[PDB]
Amino acid sequence: PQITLWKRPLVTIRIGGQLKEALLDTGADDTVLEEMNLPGKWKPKMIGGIGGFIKVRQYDQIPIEICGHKAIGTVLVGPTPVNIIGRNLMTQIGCTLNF
Amino acid sequence: PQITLWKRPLVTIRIGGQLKEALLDTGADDTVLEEMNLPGKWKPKMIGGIGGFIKVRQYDQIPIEICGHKAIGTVLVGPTPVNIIGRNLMTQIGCTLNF
Numbered sequence: 665p666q667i668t669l670w671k672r673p674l675v676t677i678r679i680g681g682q683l684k685e686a687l688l689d690t691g692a693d694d695t696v697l698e699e700m701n702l703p704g705k706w707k708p709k710m711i712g713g714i715g716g717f718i719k720v721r722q723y724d725q726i727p728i729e730i731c732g733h734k735a736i737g738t739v740l741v742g743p744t745p746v747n748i749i750g751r752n753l754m755t756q757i758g759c760t761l762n763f
Numbered sequence: 764p765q766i767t768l769w770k771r772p773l774v775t776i777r778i779g780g781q782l783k784e785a786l787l788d789t790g791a792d793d794t795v796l797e798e799m800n801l802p803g804k805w806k807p808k809m810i811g812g813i814g815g816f817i818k819v820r821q822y823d824q825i826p827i828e829i830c831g832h833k834a835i836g837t838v839l840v841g842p843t844p845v846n847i848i849g850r851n852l853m854t855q856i857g858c859t860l861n862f
């Protein structure tokens with residue numbers, strides 16, 4: 665689809681058979697989701713945002729379906745103000761900015 | 764143009780005598796620029812992201828040129844680590860997300 669920006673670009677995602685709302689975030693290198701359980705091994709990591717650094721759990725090769733478009737990649741789980749889909753996954757689903 | 768998300772979507776913006784590199788950021792409601800001493804009335808605000816909040820100065824009706832495209836609107840100014848072009852000005856230069 666084409667998504668305009670007068671409203672937040674919130675989309676429904678599917679991850680582990682759960683439906684969640686996430687923000688398509690072109691300013692985010694990484695995908696960061698609110699606290700949730702994901703299976704498999706994870707690595708402790710730290711990332712920085714506008715307000716400082718947080719601790720996250722890094723899960724690799726996680727499938728997420730974003731508006732029915734399939735991605736498989738790295739998901740960070742931790743204290744984010746909102747679920748955000750970053751460039752790592754937006755690139756996989758073919759997302760570009762256009763003006 | 765079409766801006767790839769393989770890399771951070773940095774573009775050149777102008778605000779007065781200053782040329783800056785700024786992210787086209789769909790996850791940012793409002794434009795926030797690195798510390799600079801703009802003229803005019805402003806109001807204090809706190810904006811929040813990953814890591815917590817920063818204090819900013821909200822200036823209204825500030826003209827900014829984004830890759831040659833004219834915009835005018837709210838510009839938040841404060842100790843952000845990166846210059847961010849938010850939705851408020853992206854809409855004005857015709858910017859959509861597409862996949």
Ligand SMILES: CC(C)CN(C[C@@H](O)[C@H](Cc1ccccc1)NC(=O)O[C@H]1CO[C@H]2OCC[C@H]21)S(=O)(=O)c1ccc(N)cc1
Nearest residue numbers: 691692693694712713714790791792793810811812813845
């Ligand atoms: C988290 C969002 C809901 C809001 N953020 C915009 C976001 O695009 C920032 C924009 C951003 C970018 C770099 C540094 C600080 C903020 N990105 C960000 O935190 O991404 C993190 C996840 O991937 C990593 O890559 C970049 C930092 C990490 S925000 O910067 O906090 C923000 C909040 C409010 C406004 N008005 C403007 C910006």
